[PDB]
Amino acid sequence: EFLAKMTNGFSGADLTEICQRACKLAIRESIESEIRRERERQTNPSAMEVEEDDPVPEIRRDHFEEAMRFARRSVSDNDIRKYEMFAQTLQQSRGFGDFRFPS
Amino acid sequence: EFLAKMTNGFSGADLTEICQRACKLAIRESIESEIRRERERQTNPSAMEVEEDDPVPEIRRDHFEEAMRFARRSVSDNDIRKYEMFAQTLQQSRGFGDFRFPS
Amino acid sequence: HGHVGADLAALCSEAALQAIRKKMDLIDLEDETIDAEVMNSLAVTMDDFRWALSQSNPSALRETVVEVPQVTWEDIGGLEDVKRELQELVQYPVEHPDKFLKFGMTPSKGVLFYGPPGCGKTLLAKAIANECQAN
Numbered sequence: 001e002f003l004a005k006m007t008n009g010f011s012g013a014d015l016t017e018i019c020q021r022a023c024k025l026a027i028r029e030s031i032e033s034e035i036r037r038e039r040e041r042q043t044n045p046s047a048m049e050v051e052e053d054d055p056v057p058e059i060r061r062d063h064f065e066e067a068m069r070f071a072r073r074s075v076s077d078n079d080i081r082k083y084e085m086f087a088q089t090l091q092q093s094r095g096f097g098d099f100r101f102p103s
Numbered sequence: 104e105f106l107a108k109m110t111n112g113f114s115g116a117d118l119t120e121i122c123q124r125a126c127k128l129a130i131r132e133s134i135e136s137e138i139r140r141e142r143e144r145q146t147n148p149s150a151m152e153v154e155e156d157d158p159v160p161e162i163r164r165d166h167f168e169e170a171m172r173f174a175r176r177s178v179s180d181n182d183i184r185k186y187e188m189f190a191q192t193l194q195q196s197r198g199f200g201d202f203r204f205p206s
Numbered sequence: 207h208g209h210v211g212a213d214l215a216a217l218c219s220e221a222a223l224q225a226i227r228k229k230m231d232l233i234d235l236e237d238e239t240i241d242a243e244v245m246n247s248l249a250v251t252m253d254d255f256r257w258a259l260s261q262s263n264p265s266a267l268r269e270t271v272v273e274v275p276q277v278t279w280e281d282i283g284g285l286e287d288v289k290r291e292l293q294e295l296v297q298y299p300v301e302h303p304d305k306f307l308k309f310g311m312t313p314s315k316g317v318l319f320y321g322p323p324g325c326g327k328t329l330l331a332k333a334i335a336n337e338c339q340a341n
Binding site for chain 1: 193194195196197198199200201202203204205
């Protein structure tokens with residue numbers, strides 16, 4: 001909901017991109033965390049993590065906080081006015097207005 | 104490295120040309136050096152070079168110093184600005200900027 | 207490049223024939239019946255092969271060719287962000303296909319390079335193909 005009312009003029013195809021950019025930014029860190037764990041210097045059986053540590057089990061908060069920085073609205077204001085003007089080209093119930101049948 | 108930081112605005116297809124122009128300028132001299140050696144006047148067996156003299160065994164320094172004189176940058180400044188402007192046509196993470204999740 | 211197996215058999219036979227043809231000083235007209243000397247004492251050398259490649263044998267190939275390239279990452283240094291991006295867009299959907307299945311992120315299907323003409327575009331595109339061992 002805090003992510004809802006912050007994105008104001010965003011089209012439906014733009015905020016469907018940031019929930020893949022955040023997934024890519026978390027998959028990068030989940031790949032990278034497995035690099036150091038296999039590249040442990042003097043990888044000895046002593047003090048070995050027999051359990052899977054799972055550093056990124058799910059998408060955390062700062063992934064969205066960083067993926068939001070690359071957001072961009074696709075539709076401008078000049079082209080939504082084109083659809084507002086075409087909506088005005090339809091006469092849009094304008095003319096005489098309210099009238100009543102006689103009694 | 105001295106040849107690196109001298110060529111500043113050169114594209115990748117321009118400095119790949121001078122390492123063939125220098126080869127052509129050295130192959131010209133290696134062809135020409137064999138002309139006088141077979142065209143020795145009174146070519147006698149006395150004081151004959153039984154060993155191959157090899158005047159140009161490899162590309163020397165002045166071949167690059169002379170081949171550099173015909174260098175020319177292909178891309179101007181007016182057309183790299185076209186790609187900078189197209190990079191600006193992508194919105195390039197511009198807008199609201201940094202925000203933070205509530206606590 | 208472009209030769210097929212039959213073309214290479216033809217190359218071998220023509221190089222052997224050129225090695226015969228340089229030995230006409232012993233294979234003479236006075237000796238119609240050839241003695242057993244040159245029949246087993248003639249070895250082909252490299253410039254015969256270079257002759258048989260150069261002077262003859264047009265390749266019967268014009269269509270595309272599938273292969274793994276042999277260019278390396280240090281062939282064009284720098285561009286570490288582009289290397290990281292291409293690794294993220296090519297290597298990770300094939301080297302780790304299960305982590306892309308843990309939280310369902312679908313892989314992308316292609317990038318679009320753009321820049322000035324002749325800055326190593328194809329020489330950059332072949333590098334990730336060589337690194338992934340991909341055709």
